[PDB]
Amino acid sequence: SDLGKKLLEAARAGQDDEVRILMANGADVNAEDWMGATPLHLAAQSGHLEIVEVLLKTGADVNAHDAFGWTPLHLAASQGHLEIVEVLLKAGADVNATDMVGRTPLHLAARRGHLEIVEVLLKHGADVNAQDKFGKTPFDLAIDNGNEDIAEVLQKAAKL
Ligand SMILES: [Cl-]
């Protein structure tokens, strides 16, 4: 609980050595804060790859959802952290997991303009036709945000 609180913020801040000490001293790797974020969520969101790999190696739940439904893959796709996206997928992250608004990681990558992430999620079986609670596909979010290259790629993937 107490070390868990410290682990969350050391993961967010990229404090590799502190993460390691906290885990060796028994910090709960799946500790949650007020919004259900776990250390893996915060490391994946803030782009700290080594810490993501350490947490995965010592039992972090790769498919944990926070209070908003976001999984660590949602957060890394949204924030554009490609290597972390790949490690999470390799650790078994659900490529088509959905959040509170029905969005998948591909929705968020398209909304945020992250073409490399879009291309990698597609090659790992992301659902181009998934519809969020607003009735929007990833293609719709690419158009809404003026991301024409992502939109063209998503079109080609839907066609074939
Ligand atoms: Cl684009």
Residue numbers in the entry: 2 to 161
Task: Give verbatim lines from the article.
The complex with DARPin 1238_G01 did not crystallize, but the structure of both isolated DARPins was determined as well (1238_G01, 1.6 Å resolution, R/Rfree of 16/18) and (1238_E11, 2.1 Å resolution, R/Rfree of 17/21). Of these analysed clones, only two candidates, named 1238_E11 and 1238_G01, showed a specific binding to mTFP1 while the majority of previous hits seemed to also be interacting with free streptavidin. For DARPins 1238_E11, a high affinity with an equilibrium dissociation constant (KD) value of 3 nM was determined, while the affinity of 1238_G01 was found to be lower with a value of ∼88 nM. Anti-mTFP1 DARPin 1238_E11 and DARPin 1238_G01 differ in 13 out of 21 selected library residues, suggesting alternative binding epitopes, in line with the ELISA experiments. Despite having different binding affinities, both DARPins, 1238_E11 and 1238_G01, bind in a very similar way inside the cell, suggesting that both affinities are sufficiently high.
